[PDB]
Design a protein around this motif. Structure first.
Motif, PDB file in Angstrom:
ATOM      1  N   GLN A 155       0.708  -1.211  -0.015  1.00  0.00           N
ATOM      2  CA  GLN A 155      -0.065  -0.122   0.008  1.00  0.00           C
ATOM      3  C   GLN A 155       0.904   1.207   0.146  1.00  0.00           C
ATOM      4  O   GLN A 155       1.693   1.271   0.585  1.00  0.00           O
TER       5      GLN A 155
ATOM      6  N   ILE B  24       1.945   3.372   4.233  1.00  0.00           N
ATOM      7  CA  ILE B  24       2.871   2.744   3.224  1.00  0.00           C
ATOM      8  C   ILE B  24       3.135   1.285   3.800  1.00  0.00           C
ATOM      9  O   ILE B  24       3.284   1.343   5.078  1.00  0.00           O
ATOM     10  N   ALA B  25       3.424   0.243   2.960  1.00  0.00           N
ATOM     11  CA  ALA B  25       4.204  -0.807   3.038  1.00  0.00           C
ATOM     12  C   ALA B  25       5.492  -0.711   2.559  1.00  0.00           C
ATOM     13  O   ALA B  25       5.534  -0.439   1.121  1.00  0.00           O
ATOM     14  N   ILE B  26       6.637  -0.849   3.129  1.00  0.00           N
ATOM     15  CA  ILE B  26       7.906  -0.901   2.584  1.00  0.00           C
ATOM     16  C   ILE B  26       8.599  -2.478   2.953  1.00  0.00           C
ATOM     17  O   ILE B  26       8.610  -2.604   4.193  1.00  0.00           O
ATOM     18  N   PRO B  27       9.252  -2.991   2.013  1.00  0.00           N
ATOM     19  CA  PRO B  27       9.851  -4.325   2.249  1.00  0.00           C
ATOM     20  C   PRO B  27      11.236  -4.252   2.921  1.00  0.00           C
ATOM     21  O   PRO B  27      12.048  -3.640   2.542  1.00  0.00           O
ATOM     22  N   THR B  28      11.434  -4.906   3.915  1.00  0.00           N
ATOM     23  CA  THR B  28      12.413  -5.067   4.882  1.00  0.00           C
ATOM     24  C   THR B  28      13.540  -6.277   4.307  1.00  0.00           C
ATOM     25  O   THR B  28      14.716  -6.108   4.808  1.00  0.00           O
ATOM     26  N   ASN B  29      13.150  -7.059   3.544  1.00  0.00           N
ATOM     27  CA  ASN B  29      13.894  -8.183   2.827  1.00  0.00           C
ATOM     28  C   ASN B  29      13.373  -8.445   1.541  1.00  0.00           C
ATOM     29  O   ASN B  29      12.162  -8.018   1.191  1.00  0.00           O
ATOM     30  N   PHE B  30      13.917  -9.297   0.521  1.00  0.00           N
ATOM     31  CA  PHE B  30      13.518  -9.572  -0.801  1.00  0.00           C
ATOM     32  C   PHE B  30      14.077 -11.081  -0.803  1.00  0.00           C
ATOM     33  O   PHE B  30      14.963 -11.504  -0.252  1.00  0.00           O
ATOM     34  N   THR B  31      13.582 -11.384  -1.870  1.00  0.00           N
ATOM     35  CA  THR B  31      13.696 -12.927  -2.472  1.00  0.00           C
ATOM     36  C   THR B  31      14.375 -12.540  -4.069  1.00  0.00           C
ATOM     37  O   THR B  31      13.976 -11.602  -4.566  1.00  0.00           O
ATOM     38  N   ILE B  32      15.614 -13.137  -4.171  1.00  0.00           N
ATOM     39  CA  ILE B  32      15.940 -13.436  -5.469  1.00  0.00           C
ATOM     40  C   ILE B  32      15.327 -14.664  -6.133  1.00  0.00           C
ATOM     41  O   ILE B  32      15.674 -15.589  -5.703  1.00  0.00           O
ATOM     42  N   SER B  33      14.696 -14.347  -7.411  1.00  0.00           N
ATOM     43  CA  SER B  33      14.096 -15.428  -7.991  1.00  0.00           C
ATOM     44  C   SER B  33      14.333 -15.321  -9.358  1.00  0.00           C
ATOM     45  O   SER B  33      14.962 -14.454  -9.894  1.00  0.00           O
ATOM     46  N   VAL B  34      14.595 -16.736  -9.803  1.00  0.00           N
ATOM     47  CA  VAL B  34      15.080 -17.233 -11.169  1.00  0.00           C
ATOM     48  C   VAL B  34      13.824 -17.830 -11.864  1.00  0.00           C
ATOM     49  O   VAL B  34      13.298 -18.761 -11.530  1.00  0.00           O
ATOM     50  N   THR B  35      13.059 -17.191 -13.108  1.00  0.00           N
ATOM     51  CA  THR B  35      12.164 -17.875 -13.701  1.00  0.00           C
ATOM     52  C   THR B  35      12.515 -18.199 -15.165  1.00  0.00           C
ATOM     53  O   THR B  35      13.052 -17.266 -15.734  1.00  0.00           O
ATOM     54  N   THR B  36      12.055 -19.483 -15.437  1.00  0.00           N
ATOM     55  CA  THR B  36      12.311 -19.821 -16.670  1.00  0.00           C
ATOM     56  C   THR B  36      11.376 -19.115 -17.675  1.00  0.00           C
ATOM     57  O   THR B  36      10.281 -18.847 -17.293  1.00  0.00           O
ATOM     58  N   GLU B  37      11.931 -18.906 -18.807  1.00  0.00           N
ATOM     59  CA  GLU B  37      10.884 -18.562 -20.034  1.00  0.00           C
ATOM     60  C   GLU B  37      11.436 -19.472 -21.256  1.00  0.00           C
ATOM     61  O   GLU B  37      12.655 -19.552 -21.495  1.00  0.00           O
TER      62      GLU B  37
ATOM     63  N   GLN C   3      20.898 -16.895  -2.429  1.00  0.00           N
ATOM     64  CA  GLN C   3      19.572 -16.948  -3.196  1.00  0.00           C
ATOM     65  C   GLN C   3      19.717 -17.315  -4.545  1.00  0.00           C
ATOM     66  O   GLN C   3      18.814 -18.133  -5.109  1.00  0.00           O
ATOM     67  N   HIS C 141      15.593 -15.869 -16.325  1.00  0.00           N
ATOM     68  CA  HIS C 141      15.523 -14.451 -15.992  1.00  0.00           C
ATOM     69  C   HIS C 141      15.786 -14.256 -14.229  1.00  0.00           C
ATOM     70  O   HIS C 141      15.016 -14.852 -13.617  1.00  0.00           O
ATOM     71  N   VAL C 145      12.985  -9.432  -5.896  1.00  0.00           N
ATOM     72  CA  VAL C 145      11.507  -9.414  -5.639  1.00  0.00           C
ATOM     73  C   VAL C 145      11.138  -9.057  -4.116  1.00  0.00           C
ATOM     74  O   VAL C 145      11.828  -9.561  -3.202  1.00  0.00           O
TER      75      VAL C 145
END
Ligand SMILES: *[C@@H]1O[C@H](CO)[C@@H](O[C@@H]2O[C@H](CO)[C@@H](O[C@H]3O[C@H](CO)[C@@H](O)[C@H](O)[C@@H]3O)[C@H](O)[C@H]2NC(C)=O)[C@H](O)[C@H]1NC(C)=O
Ligand SMILES: *[C@@H]1O[C@H](CO)[C@@H](O[C@@H]2O[C@H](CO)[C@@H](O[C@H]3O[C@H](CO)[C@@H](O)[C@H](O)[C@@H]3O)[C@H](O)[C@H]2NC(C)=O)[C@H](O)[C@H]1NC(C)=O
Ligand SMILES: *[C@@H]1O[C@H](CO)[C@@H](O[C@@H]2O[C@H](CO)[C@@H](O[C@H]3O[C@H](CO)[C@@H](O)[C@H](O)[C@@H]3O)[C@H](O)[C@H]2NC(C)=O)[C@H](O)[C@H]1NC(C)=O
Ligand SMILES: *[C@@H]1O[C@H](CO[C@@H]2O[C@@H](C)[C@@H](O)[C@@H](O)[C@@H]2O)[C@@H](O[C@@H]2O[C@H](CO)[C@@H](O)[C@H](O)[C@H]2NC(C)=O)[C@H](O)[C@H]1NC(C)=O
Ligand SMILES: *[C@@H]1O[C@H](CO)[C@@H](O[C@@H]2O[C@H](CO)[C@@H](O)[C@H](O)[C@H]2NC(C)=O)[C@H](O)[C@H]1NC(C)=O
Ligand SMILES: *[C@@H]1O[C@H](CO)[C@@H](O[C@@H]2O[C@H](CO)[C@@H](O)[C@H](O)[C@H]2NC(C)=O)[C@H](O)[C@H]1NC(C)=O
Ligand SMILES: *[C@@H]1O[C@H](CO)[C@@H](O)[C@H](O)[C@H]1NC(C)=O
Ligand SMILES: *[C@@H]1O[C@H](CO)[C@@H](O)[C@H](O)[C@H]1NC(C)=O
Ligand SMILES: *[C@@H]1O[C@H](CO)[C@@H](O)[C@H](O)[C@H]1NC(C)=O
Ligand SMILES: *[C@@H]1O[C@H](CO)[C@@H](O)[C@H](O)[C@H]1NC(C)=O
Lengths: 328, 41, 239, 49, 45
Positions: A155, B24-37, C3, C141, C145
Motif C-alpha cells: 500500500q 505505506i508498506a516498505i519491504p525489509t527483505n527481498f527474494t532473488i528469484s529465477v524464472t524460466t521462459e 539465493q 531471468h 522481489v
C-alpha cells in the motif's frame, strides 16, 4: 479476441445425407484438419484473453472509503448496484458494440448458421470474470502503484504514488503537491470528457466493430455459398437425391463437394490469417497492460500521446480499452 | 472415490489492500528469484 | 549469491521431473510432424479415382481412359499441397513473430537491463541468462522481489522552519514515533538530514504535510567550532 | 507498405466472354470475397503509411 | 549545490558569466561577525 466458431464440416457440406458423407470420405481427412485448424484458432482465443486479463494472481478490492486526495474513480471502479460489476465507462463500451450472438443458450443469420453446423462457442472467461480481473487490475493500481505487478502488493497513499509518478516523467515531487487540487480536477475533467465523448459519438469503437463485422460477414458468406450450383442441377442437396439415381447423383454430389469443400478451406484460411492479426493485437494488448497498467512507461507515445503517468484498463466486447493518463 | 467435478472457477486469492491516506508498506527483505521462459526460435 | 545459487537449483529441480514445461516447443514439433503425417495420409484419398495408387491406374488403363482418372489424383493432390503450404506459410509467420520476440528479449534482457515491467519475467529485472533448446531458446531471468513489508505512517513532506521539505530520493516514514527518510524499494531508514532532503515553498499549500524537525548536519560542526572558540576566549582572559 | 492491387474477377477469369461469365455465376460470391480480400490489403497500405 | 564543475572557462563554446552562490558562505560570514563581536568584547576588560 475474435468470436469463437466451430463448423461441423459434414453438416455444412452434407446436412443429413448419408450419401454425401460416404462420398466426402473420398477426399480423406480434409474435414478433420479443418476441425483441427479451427480448434487451433479457438484454443488461442482463450490464451489471448487470459494473457491480456490474468496479469494478476489476486482479486484486489478497493477500500470502501474513497480517500484518494480528490481523484474520482467512481466512473471506472465497480458499480456494486449492477449485476455486471462493470464501470460507468464499461457500460457505455458494452452498449456501443451490438454482438450477433456469443453462445447464450439457443433452445436471423444465426439460425441459418446453426442449421449448417456453424456454432458460436462461449469464451472461457465470462464478461463478468473479465470485469473482475479488470476490477482487480484497477483496484491494485489505485492502492498499490506498480508494486502489485513486481511482487506482493504494497500500500501507498495515492498522492504519494503520483509524486513518484511525476519523478518518472522527469518532474520534481513538489510540483504535484503545490498543485494537487488542480491535478485531481484536471483528471476528473478528463474522465468526464471520455464519458461525454463515448456517450455522444457513433464512430469511436470502429477498431473493434470492424473485427466483429468481418466475423459476422464471413459466416454470412460461408452460409451464402450453399446457394451456389457449382454447375450441378441444384444447390439443394435433396433436390438432387430425390430427383436422380445413385450413379447420376455421384456427378452432381461430387460437384457440390468440389464447391463446398473449397468454400470451407477458403474460410479457414481467412480465419487463420485473421487470427494472426488478432493474436498480434492481443499480444500487444497484454504488453500494454504489463507496461502501462502494471507499470509506468518511459517509452514515447507507447501509452497514449504525452509523458505517461498511468493507465486504467476497461473491458469491451472482444477487446480492451486503455484509459492512458498523461502529463502535457 | 475420485470423480470428475465441474465448478465455476476461482480466479485467484481474493484480497483487500490495506490502503489509507497516510499508510505505506516498505519491504525489509527481498527474494532473488529465477524464472524460466521458453520461446520457439 | 546464495539465493541465486538456490533459485538455479530450483530451475534444475523443476525441469528435472515434470514433462509439461517444454510444451510450447513440443507443440511446434507436434504441428510440423502432424501436418507432414496429414499430408502423407492424403496420398490414400481416392478423389473418386479407381485407386489411391497412380501406378495401378497405369497398370490397368490406356491413355484415353487413364487421363480421366489421373487428372482427379492430380487435382486432389495439388489441392492437398496447396493446403499444406498455406498452413505452413501461416504457421511460419507465428514462428517469425516468436523469433523477433526471442531476439528482442535477448537484446534487452541478456545484453541489457530492461525497465519494461513483466517483460523479462516477474519481479524487478536484474539480468537474464540464455540457454539453447531444440528449435527454441530458454531464458533464465533473474529478478529482485520485495518480500517482508512493515506498515508505517508516511508523510508527503516535512515542516521544520516554515519551509516544506521533500526527499531527494526515497520517501518519509514514521516507525510510529520518529520520522525517517528511506529508499522506495527497500527499508533502510535514516535521519531526515538537510542532505537527504530538498526544499520548495512553505507549508500552507501541501495537503497532509506535518510537523517534524530537520537536522542541518553543518550546524553542530559550527556549534562545536563555537565551544572550541569560547574556550579560546576563556583562556585568553587569563594572561 | 507494398503495391495496392485490385482485380476484375470476371475480366481475369472470363475476359471478354459472356459465355464463361454464365458458368462463373454458378460459383456465386467467390469473386466478391477475393475483391474484399484485396480491398482490405489496399486500405491497410494507406493505414501503415 | 545545483551545479557540478569541470574545466576552466575557455573550453565551453557559448559560456557565460553569472554570480554563483555558496550557501556555506554567509553561514561562515554571520559567524565571522558574531566572532568579531566576541574579539571586541574581550578588549573591554
Ligand atoms: C523508532 O526509531 C527510533 C530509532 O531507532 C527508536 O528510538 C531509539 O531507541 C534506542 C533504544 O532502543 C535508543 O538507543 C539509546 O538508548 C539510550 C539513550 O540514552 C542509551 O543507553 C543507548 O546506549 C542508546 O544510545 C535510541 O537513542 C533511540 N533513538 C531515538 C531517535 O529516540 C524508537 O524506539 C522507535 N520506535 C518504536 C515504537 O519502535
Ligand atoms: C505545526 O507547527 C506550527 C509551528 O509551531 C504550528 O503553527 C502555529 O499555530 C498556532 C495556533 O494556530 C499559532 O498561534 C497564533 O495564532 C494566531 C496567529 O496565527 C494568533 O491570533 C494567536 O493568538 C496565536 O498567537 C502560531 O502562530 C503558529 N505558528 C507557526 C509558525 O505556524 C501549527 O499550528 C502546527 N500544526 C499542527 C498540525 O500541529
Ligand atoms: C566574463 O567574466 C570574466 C571575469 O570578469 C572576464 O574575464 C576577464 O576578461 C578581461 C578582458 O579580457 C581580462 O583583462 C585583462 O586581459 C589581459 C590578461 O588576460 C591583460 O593583458 C589586460 O591588461 C587585462 O588586465 C581579465 O583578466 C579577465 N579575468 C578573468 C578571471 O577572466 C570575461 O572577459 C567575461 N566575459 C564576458 C563574455 O563578459
Ligand atoms: C497493516 O495494518 C492493517 C490494518 O491496520 C491496522 O489494523 C489493526 C489490526 C491495528 O494494527 C491498527 O493499529 C491498524 O489500523 C492490517 O490489516 C489486517 O490484516 C489481518 C490479516 O493479517 C485482517 O484479519 C484484519 O482484518 C486487517 N485489518 C484491517 C483494519 O485491515 C495489515 O495486516 C497490516 N499489515 C502488517 C504487515 O502488519
Ligand atoms: C464523483 O463524481 C460522480 C459523478 O461522475 C459523483 O456522483 C454523482 O453525485 C451526485 C450528488 O450526489 C448525484 O446527483 C449523481 O447522480 C452522481 N452520479 C453518478 C454517476 O453516480 C460523485 O459524488 C463524485 N465523488 C465525490 C467524492 O465528489
Ligand atoms: C532475509 O530472508 C532470508 C531468507 O530468505 C533470511 O536468511 C535466513 O535467516 C534464518 C535466521 O534468521 C536462517 O535460519 C536461514 O538459514 C537463512 N537463510 C539464508 C538463505 O541465509 C535473512 O536472515 C533475512 N534477513 C533480513 C535482514 O530480514
Ligand atoms: C485522512 O483522511 C481522514 C478522513 O477520511 C482524516 O480524518 C484524517 O485526518 C486524514 N489524515 C491525513 C494524514 O491526511
Ligand atoms: C592557553 O593559551 C596559552 C597561550 O596564551 C597556552 O600556553 C596554553 O597552553 C593554553 N591553554 C589551554 C588550556 O588551551
Ligand atoms: C548566436 O548567433 C548570433 C547570430 O544570431 C551570433 O551573433 C552569436 O555570437 C551566437 N552566439 C553563440 C554563443 O553561438
Ligand atoms: C559583552 O558580552 C557579555 C556577554 O558575554 C555581555 O554581558 C556584556 O554586556 C557585553 N559588553 C559589551 C560592552 O558589549
Amino acid at each position: 479476441s475474435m468470436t469463437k466458431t466451430s463448423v461441423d464440416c459434414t453438416m455444412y457440406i452434407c446436412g443429413d445425407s448419408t450419401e454425401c458423407s460416404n462420398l466426402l470420405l473420398q477426399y480423406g481427412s480434409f474435414c478433420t484438419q479443418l476441425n483441427r485448424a479451427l480448434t487451433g484458432i479457438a484454443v488461442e482465443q482463450d490464451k489471448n484473453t487470459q494473457e491480456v486479463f490474468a496479469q494478476v494472481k489476486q482479486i484486489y478490492k478497493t477500500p470502501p472509503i474513497k480517500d484518494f486526495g480528490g481523484f474520482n474513480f467512481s466512473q471506472i471502479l465497480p458499480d456494486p448496484s449492477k449485476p455486471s460489476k462493470r464501470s460507468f465507462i464499461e457500460d457505455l463500451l458494452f452498449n456501443k458494440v451490438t454482438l450477433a450472438d456469443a453462445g447464450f443458450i439457443k433452445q436471423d443469420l444465426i439460425c441459418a448458421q446453426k442449421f449448417n453446423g456453424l456454432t458460436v462457442l462461449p469464451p472461457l472467461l465470462t464478461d463478468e470474470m473479465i470485469a473482475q480481473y479488470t476490477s482487480a487490475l484497477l483496484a491494485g493500481t489505485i492502492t498499490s502503484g506498480w508494486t502489485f505487478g513486481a511482487g506482493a502488493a504494497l500500500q501507498i497513499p495515492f498522492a504519494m504514488q503520483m509524486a513518484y509518478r511525476f519523478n518518472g516523467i522527469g518532474v520534481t515531487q513538489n510540483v504535484l503537491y503545490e498543485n494537487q487540487k488542480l491535478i485531481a480536477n484536471q483528471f476528473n475533467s478528463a474522465i468526464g470528457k471520455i464519458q461525454d465523448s463515448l456517450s455522444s459519438t457513433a464512430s469511436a469503437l470502429g477498431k473493434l466493430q470492424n473485427v466483429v463485422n468481418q466475423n459476422a460477414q464471413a459466416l454470412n458468406t460461408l452460409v451464402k455459398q450453399l446457394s451456389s450450383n457449382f454447375g450441378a442441377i441444384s444447390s439443394v442437396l435433396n433436390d438432387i437425391l430425390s430427383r436422380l439415381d445413385k450413379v447420376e447423383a455421384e456427378v452432381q454430389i461430387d460437384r457440390l463437394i468440389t464447391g463446398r469443400l473449397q468454400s470451407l478451406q477458403t474460410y479457414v484460411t481467412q480465419q487463420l490469417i485473421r487470427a494472426a492479426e488478432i493474436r498480434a493485437s492481443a499480444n500487444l494488448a497484454a504488453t500494454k497492460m504489463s507496461e502501462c497498467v502494471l507499470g509506468q512507461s518511459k517509452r514515447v507515445d507507447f501509452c497514449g500521446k504525452g509523458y505517461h503517468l498511468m493507465s486504467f484498463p476497461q473491458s469491451a466486447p472482444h477487446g480492451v480499452v486503455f484509459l492512458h493518463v498523461t502529463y502535457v | 472415490s475420485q470423480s470428475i467435478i465441474a465448478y465455476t472457477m476461482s480466479l485467484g486469492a481474493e484480497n483487500s489492500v490495506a490502503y489509507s491516506n497516510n499508510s505505506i508498506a516498505i519491504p525489509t527483505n527481498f527474494t532473488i528469484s529465477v524464472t524460466t521462459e521458453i520461446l520457439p526460435v | 549469491a546464495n539465493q541465486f545459487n538456490s533459485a538455479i537449483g530450483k530451475i534444475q529441480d523443476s525441469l528435472s521431473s515434470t514433462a509439461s514445461a517444454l510444451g510450447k516447443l513440443q507443440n511446434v514439433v507436434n504441428q510440423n510432424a502432424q501436418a507432414l503425417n496429414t499430408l502423407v495420409k492424403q496420398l490414400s484419398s481416392n478423389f473418386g479415382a479407381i485407386s489411391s495408387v497412380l501406378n495401378d491406374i497405369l497398370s490397368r488403363l490406356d491413355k484415353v481412359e487413364a487421363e480421366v482418372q489421373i487428372d482427379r489424383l492430380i487435382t486432389g493432390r495439388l489441392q492437398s499441397l496447396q493446403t499444406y503450404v498455406t498452413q505452413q506459410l501461416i504457421r511460419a509467420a507465428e514462428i517469425r513473430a516468436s523469433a523477433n520476440l526471442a531476439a528482442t528479449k535477448m537484446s534487452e534482457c541478456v545484453l541489457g537491463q530492461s525497465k519494461r515491467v513483466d517483460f523479462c519475467g516477474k519481479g524487478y529485472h536484474l539480468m537474464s541468462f540464455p540457454q539453447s533448446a531444440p528449435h527454441g531458446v530458454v531464458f533464465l531471468h533473474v529478478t529482485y522481489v520485495p518480500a517482508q513489508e512493515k506498515n508505517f505512517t508516511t508523510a508527503p513532506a516535512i515542516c521544520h522552519d516554515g519551509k516544506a521539505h521533500f526527499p531527494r530520493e526515497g520517501v518519509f516514514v514514521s516507525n510510529g514515533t520518529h520520522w525517517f527518510v528511506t529508499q522506495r524499494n527497500f527499508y533502510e531508514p535514516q535521519i531526515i538530514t538537510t542532505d537527504n532532503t530538498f526544499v520548495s515553498g512553505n507549508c500552507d499549500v501541501v495537503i497532509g504535510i506535518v510537523n517534524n524537525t530537520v537536522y542541518d548536519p553543518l550546524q553542530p560542526e559550527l556549534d562545536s567550532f563555537k565551544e572550541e572558540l569560547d574556550k579560546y576566549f576563556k583562556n585568553h582572559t587569563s594572561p
